Design a protein around this ligand. Structure first.
Ligand code: NA
Ligand code: NA
Ligand code: NA
Ligand code: NA
Lengths: 260, 260, 260, 260
């Protein structure tokens, strides 16, 4: 009857919601901190530095150590460093991702790069896509930062990183190695930093396809909170139920545990 | 032992090859004309008017009546007119396609168009893709002009119309109605203009996935000539052999026929 | 303002429903007959001879000439005869399909058949699937009779012909040529027998994915009647609306027409 | 310049080949043992107990502790125990898999089982497939033991577990959680038993799509030995090269390491 010993937690839709608060999300982090329970904040977003995420969270009454924040950009860089294929890349994405990759020592090579890395680019163009296509055809290791097919905006549900990757997969017949949730690489790396065994951890989030499938596919218990992307109405028809479903994180006691 | 009574024929790779001649292709049309055998020239290209195709072919010693030329742009417009969903559209593509659609009376509606039509756009942008995504989500009838995943260029095999459509299918979960070869709509419409029964026609081309599958999927005999996209080396491993495989159209006698 | 000149019409779910009547379906055929309007009854079912369909329909007060009935089995045989690849086949399916193929002169070849043909087999086995896999790998022309993923039964929605084909596509990497609705081959052949131009015909049925997509994908107007597979509640969320949606075929006047 | 500290190693195609020896594979294990380097033998096969694998390996001059053997059956049971959805299952597979699941306390429930588990069944039938389909539709957690599309036999490349899963995915629209290589679950669990950090481990095998993609997708260095499924000729066209490619395991020194 041991309680969970560590937490992996989504941000947008869970701890805050766009520009709006989720006060129970703020209290969830507050309570983790008061109890001394380790956690990681795990996001597919590739546009912010961890410093920027940390500062943004202060506006929602969350003061979290820098080292608790783990983004798909960090995991992408970490994977590139591990695979050790060479310090050249061609990148499609926002400045945050491009700067992280360049800061890690990867220099732009538009023709024979070791890596082609593709995240959301709000200003993607045919020519960027053609450049990536040829580079992939020429043998670069093709990485997608995150598989999300859409990104919610004030305009509506626009194409996400996963849709841009879909164009290149169609054009090259090469499937990208996707780093972000629900895939293994970001989960393994976040678990490593958490330094708690997988069977003592819980993944907490609002998004069934990224957060909850992250737990199902990687064998980690799951807490779905219905404050974000996955609506209350959608829960009954989920093919695989999460370990827990909550309307508010205030319902969580921290006494919950695996097989407990 | 009746010879084929009509021909459906690809252009680039078959009658000419980019800026270069295929002299036996020119002689194939010459011989059709001398024998009085009806034919259509059927292309997935969406960037030229039939007038432009006709003029271009003169440079390769081919003088063909305007009415022999049938492009994926024409078939797209014809399909839109038939389906009669309304005279509004949002189009991704080159000027040739956009002008044809506007000339047909479709006015641009970026929000609630009856149709979203997607062909190759050498200058596609995130914002054009986002606009199409929302319009499709809002209920527009989503049409792809042609399914080709790539387009050959001097640079290499770049993303084609089919790859741009792939991004939108990923972002919307809606599969486009593809008009161009090897799909039925362009084939039915070309056959209609040809005015010869399907079982008395042959589809002639260089490209297995567009021309030869056009015949296999639509039940029309096929002549593969290995002067273009599908190489001589690839022929043995084709999953379904064409009705005929030729190294040069000069080998064709016009005495060939169905079950003959 | 010309009325439609010919009809293509689904059976189960439209003219009758399993063992139960749809009286307005019976009256639809009665009215067609009284008005002298040509029609075809077009079904993906591969288990009955057209004689058997004709006799069964008598129990639902429908007396229809034998030549009005066109099944996926007939269209499969017709396609095999047209493609003229040789009088050998390996077949997965029920006795009705196997007998039709043998009656057409195709002899069983388990190793090097010209054709592999796959429909629903209520008693499919690993060994039949392995036999078909090897035969396809060896170069046989792989045909699926109909693409339906499921078949409704008293037990529930069981795997259909399309699901059996899916196993073989996975095992061989070869996609079958699917004959049945909504694909072109059965539609072209039914239209040929109907002998009415495509733009003067309407496809009538209860099943969006087979009957209504048959019209959308092949450019034929569509009448969805909500007495069968596609429910009234599902209509608003259809990606492409049918030309007409009716709760009962009694609402149809026969004065309806294309662009009319 | 630290050498790898642990090994994950495929069996058939790597340590032996069907009924035939790979003597350098036997010497690879001998050398690991002499050097005291920990290893796991990781296989997608679901038909043998680890005792049976251990006995079989003795015939190839390999004496390995029982605890070094980790199969897709073990990992499937482990995952079912972890997910803790209930002690009922419906299983498609061979007796080895069925016995392991029953030994773990899962009782057969053909209607409302907590789990549906699908591996290769040499005698699969329509009725077993229909039973699984309904059980999945009814909400069971659908698990595929291993994703391999084919299984090599004396007859040829027959349908594998992944192809049987493909039928059920088509019939249900539910994708299985695949346990076996190259998926994360079997890799994480083997790594756990190995008790060596991921970045100090190497995955060794003959099969690009299962063993080498296991390393690429899960961020573990890879040794491809060309004695089995992936041929020497196929190596140049691999989309992502392994960390090492060897013609014989005799070329490996055990001085090789990560970034070393
Ligand atoms: Na979220
Ligand atoms: Na061509
Ligand atoms: Na029906
Ligand atoms: Na192997």
């Amino acid at each position: 009857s041991l309680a969970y010993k560590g937490y992996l937690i989504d941000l947008d839709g869970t701890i805050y919601k766009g520009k709006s608060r989720i006060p129970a999300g703020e209290r969830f982090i507050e309570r983790l901190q008061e109890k001394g329970i380790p956690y990681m904040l795990v996001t597919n977003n590739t546009t912010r530095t961890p410093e920027s995420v940390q500062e943004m969270l202060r506006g929602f009454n969350v003061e979290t150590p820098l080292e608790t924040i783990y983004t798909a950009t960090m995991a992408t860089v970490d994977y590139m460093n591990d695979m050790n294929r060479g310090k050249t890349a061609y990148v499609i994405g926002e400045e945050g991702l491009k700067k992280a990759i360049a800061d890690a020592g990867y220099v732009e090579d538009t023709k024979n790069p070791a890596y082609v890395v593709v995240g959301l680019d709000w200003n993607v163009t045919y020519d960027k896509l053609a450049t990536a296509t040829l580079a992939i055809q020429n043998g670069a290791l093709f990485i997608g930062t995150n598989p999300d097919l859409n990104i919610p905006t004030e305009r509506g549900l626009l194409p996400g990183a996963g849709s841009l990757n879909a164009l290149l997969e169609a054009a090259t017949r090469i499937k990208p190695v996707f780093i972000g949730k629900p895939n293994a690489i970001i989960m393994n790396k976040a678990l490593e930093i958490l330094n708690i065994p997988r069977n003592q951890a819980v993944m907490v989030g609002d998004n069934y396809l990224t957060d909850i499938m992250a737990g199902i596919n990687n064998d980690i218990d799951t807490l779905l909170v219905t404050t974000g992307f996955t609506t209350v109405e959608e829960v009954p028809d989920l093919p695989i139920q999460p370990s827990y479903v909550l309307a508010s994180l205030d319902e969580w006691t921290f006494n919950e545990g695996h097989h407990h």
